[PDB]
């Protein structure tokens, strides 16, 4: 892991949260060395992400240095495109909507840069419609520098210079997984494809495209700029990089922060700045991920670092990197049943495990928070959690049993006394 | 609830604005032609923009514009959330109750709203235009149990804002489209500075 | 004409046996020796079905509304 840091400094991938948020003149970081990066070959850029080894902070590994070089034909007869996601499907992420708030010019750099690694034609980005005031600034940034002739269709220095178009959904779901957004951009309803056709860079829109996250190509200019042997400075040999974090729940300042790999939760959460609940001597049930990482109690998790394998050394990994706690006021089974209640209103409905299997759990988790009849219902509920992992298509099928099964662990008398109390109430 | 139309307004009718027919040319020029064929997501949204809520004849209007079968229009607007079929009001307001928003005491930004206003839970107003529903997953659970509106967001909601945002909108004001109090930019608050400087020698790209 | 039942003559009218193949199919009809007539077994096409070609760039094999 190194020297357990993961510090917070100015030498990060952010320009400024407070410097200037509107269109500007690209003062320090934006468009510093423009033509010199693309003047080199793609083989200079392919494998340059291997110096970083950015796993992709969407919630899963399989690093971007591999999926862009490998699983990428040169050309057959048909063009290639870029899909840069921007929508946040996980509850309480907030890592997005702040990058576009004050840094609009940083993302436009790695669009042509990351596309040059693929040689794709154009750039299509997808934003939620509900983030409506912030998305208006994005086309203003296109009006700022792209409309100033800095990019496209020959700017600068080479024939490789292209555009960026903005689309919006309404209330969609295809943030949470790929290959539905490439279906929804056609105009179909949003019922995602099977995962191995021909996967997404073989069978796509009409022609094979690539899908990335925000910081999968937002850090791509500066990681191509500062490079190193610096992108692996924190963490072990497995993971590398400095990611944005977000703090919510019960804290003195629920806010974002910047850290890097392999920091333990006792120092990471309580710093910046306050621990307004019982920072110790409370229950402090922590959630490592957005939603797919279940509750971990007050044990050695606070000293367990934020490596991908450290939470794999715990019961559940977390790549979404969201921090919410439940110390004193929160009932354990009350909050998590509302998390299960949430999934009824965003399931697609294709897979017969997913459809009618979630609302199996919906009707029984509302029975436990009420307090109800005799046990061994827990184990039957536990077998259903052991019955939907790899039967569905999307990761929502994995995102439906992991909060449930992690509640079965670590909390045996979460309701073994509560449902007995209702059994004591009727008796 | 039910999702059908038992024939109240089969032909309302509805037409588009002559200012808005030319905007289609920007929309069709985006997609690759031949497989272009369906730009129904911004276009039917723009029909919601002109009308506010759209009838079933408004669905049938755009089907001849983009030569799709009209059944392939009913699939879209009955799936997504922001499209509306029933008649709606002028102000559409949303309580963003989510499970971490529940941890930020959404019960305060729950009722004492219906007692303040005079409406029912999850229900439009009896008079005209206030419609109140609840949504999930719009960014910041790191703020308060915040309030969404038609074109902006109201961060840092509070029972004072319950006595304000309902109150100022009944009067016709615009109650602070953003964080009304506290941190105006949602800053780390003890790390908000982070030594604001030029980013330590750009020009490392020899490599 | 008392109930409407399907009373009948034609004393055989219900005799089906289970044969193994076409080879001993003929050999049983001749061993007792009355007239017959033979159909032929129909097996369908194998056939060529492949998902993935249901999303085209210029072809016609393209599904929608799924």
């Amino acid at each position: 892991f190194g020297s357990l840091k993961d510090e917070d400094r100015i030498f990060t991938n952010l320009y400024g949260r407070h410097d200037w948020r509107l269109k500007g003149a690209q003062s320090r970081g934006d468009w510093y060395k423009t033509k010199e990066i693309l003047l080199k070959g793609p083989d200079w850029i392919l494998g340059e992400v291997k110096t970083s080894g950015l796993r992709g902070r969407g919630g899963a590994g399989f690093p971007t240095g591999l999926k862009w070089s490998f699983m990428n034909k040169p050309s057959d007869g048909r063009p290639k495109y870029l899909v840069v996601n921007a929508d946040e499907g996980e509850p309480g992420t907030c890592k997005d909507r702040e990058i576009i708030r004050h840094d609009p010019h940083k993302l436009v750099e790695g669009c042509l840069v990351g596309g040059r690694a693929m040689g794709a034609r154009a750039a299509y980005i997808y934003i939620r419609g509900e983030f409506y005031n912030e998305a208006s600034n994005l086309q203003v940034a296109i009006r700022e520098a792209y409309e100033a002739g800095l990019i496209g269709k020959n700017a600068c220095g080479s024939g490789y210079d292209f555009d960026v178009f903005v689309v919006r959904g309404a209330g969609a779901y295809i943030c949470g997984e790929e290959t539905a957004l490439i279906e929804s951009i056609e105009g179909k309803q949003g019922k995602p494809r099977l995962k191995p056709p021909f996967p997404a860079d073989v069978g796509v829109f009409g022609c094979p495209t690539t899908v990335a996250n925000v910081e999968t190509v937002a850090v791509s200019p500066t990681i191509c700029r500062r490079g190193g042997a610096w992108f692996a400075s924190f963490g072990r040999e497995r993971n590398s990089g400095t990611k944005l974090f977000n703090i919510s729940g019960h804290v003195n300042n629920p806010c974002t922060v910047e850290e890097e790999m392999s920091v333990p939760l006792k120092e990471l959460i309580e710093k910046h700045a306050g621990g307004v609940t019982g920072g110790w001597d409370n229950l402090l049930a922590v959630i490592p991920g957005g939603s797919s990482t279940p509750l971990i109690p007050k044990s050695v998790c606070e000293t367990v670092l934020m490596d991908f394998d450290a939470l794999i050394q715990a019961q559940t990994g977390l790549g979404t990197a969201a921090v919410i706690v439940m110390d004193r006021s929160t009932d354990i089974v009350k909050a998590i049943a509302r998390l299960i209640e949430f999934y009824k209103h965003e399931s697609c409905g294709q897979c017969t495990p997913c459809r009618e299997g979630v609302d199996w759990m919906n009707k029984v988790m509302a029975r436990f928070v009420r307090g109800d009849a005799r046990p061994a219902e827990i184990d039957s509920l536990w077998e259903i959690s052991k019955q939907i992992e790899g039967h569905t298509i999307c990761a929502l099928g994995d995102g439906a049993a992991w909060p449930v099964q992690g509640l079965i662990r670590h909390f045996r008398p979460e309701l073994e006394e509560r449902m007995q109390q209702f059994a004591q109430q009727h008796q | 609830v039910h999702r059908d139309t038992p024939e109240n307004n089969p032909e309302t009718p509805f037409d588009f604005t002559p200012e808005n027919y030319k905007r289609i040319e920007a929309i069709v020029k985006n997609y690759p032609e031949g497989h272009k064929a369906a730009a129904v997501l911004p276009v039917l949204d723009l029909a919601q923009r002109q009308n506010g809520w759209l009838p079933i004849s408004a669905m049938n209007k755009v089907a001849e514009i983009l030569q799709v079968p009209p059944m392939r229009v009913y699939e879209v607007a009955t799936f997504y959330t922001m499209y509306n079929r029933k008649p709606v009001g002028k102000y559409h307001i949303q309580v963003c109750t989510t499970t971490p928003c529940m941890l930020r005491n959404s019960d305060s930004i729950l009722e004492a709203i219906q007692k303040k206003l005079g409406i029912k839970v999850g229900e439009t107003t009896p008079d005209k235009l206030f419609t109140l529903i609840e949504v999930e997953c719009l960014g910041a659970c790191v703020n308060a149990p915040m309030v969404q509106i038609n074109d902006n967001y109201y961060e840092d909601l509070t029972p004072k804002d319950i006595e304000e945002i309902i109150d100022e909108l009944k009067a016709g004001k615009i109650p602070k489209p953003g964080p009304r109090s506290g941190r105006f930019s949602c800053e780390p608050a003890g790390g908000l500075t982070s030594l604001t400087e030029p980013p330590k020698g750009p020009g490392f790209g020899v490599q | 004409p008392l109930m409407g039942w399907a009373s009948t003559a034609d004393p055989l009218s219900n005799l089906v046996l289970t044969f193994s193949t076409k080879e001993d199919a003929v050999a049983f009809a001749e061993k007792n020796g009355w007239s017959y007539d033979v159909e032929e077994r129909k097996v369908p096409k194998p056939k060529s079905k492949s998902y993935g070609a249901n999303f085209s760039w210029n072809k016609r094999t393209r599904v929608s509304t799924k």
């Binding site: 048909r78 063009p79 154009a122 409506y132 005031n133 208006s136 086309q139 296109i142 009006r143 792209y146 409309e147 496209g152 269709k153 555009d163 178009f165 903005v166 009409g206 | 030319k22 905007r23 040319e25 920007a26 929309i27 020029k29 985006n30 997609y31 690759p32 032609e33 031949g34 497989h35 272009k36 911004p42 723009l46 923009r49 038609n150 074109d151 902006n152 489209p177 | 085209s56 760039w57 210029n58 072809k59 016609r60 393209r62």
Partner: peptide, 28 residues
């Protein structure tokens, strides 16, 4: 923060310059 002025987003600059497109055919 303005509900209208999507023609500023759509028809102002993105209609003046697409560019070009060629967009392929795909007739089908």
């Amino acid at each position: 923060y303005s509900t209208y002025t999507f023609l500023d987003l759509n028809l102002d600059l993105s209609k003046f310059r697409m560019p070009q497109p060629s967009s392929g055919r795909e007739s089908p």
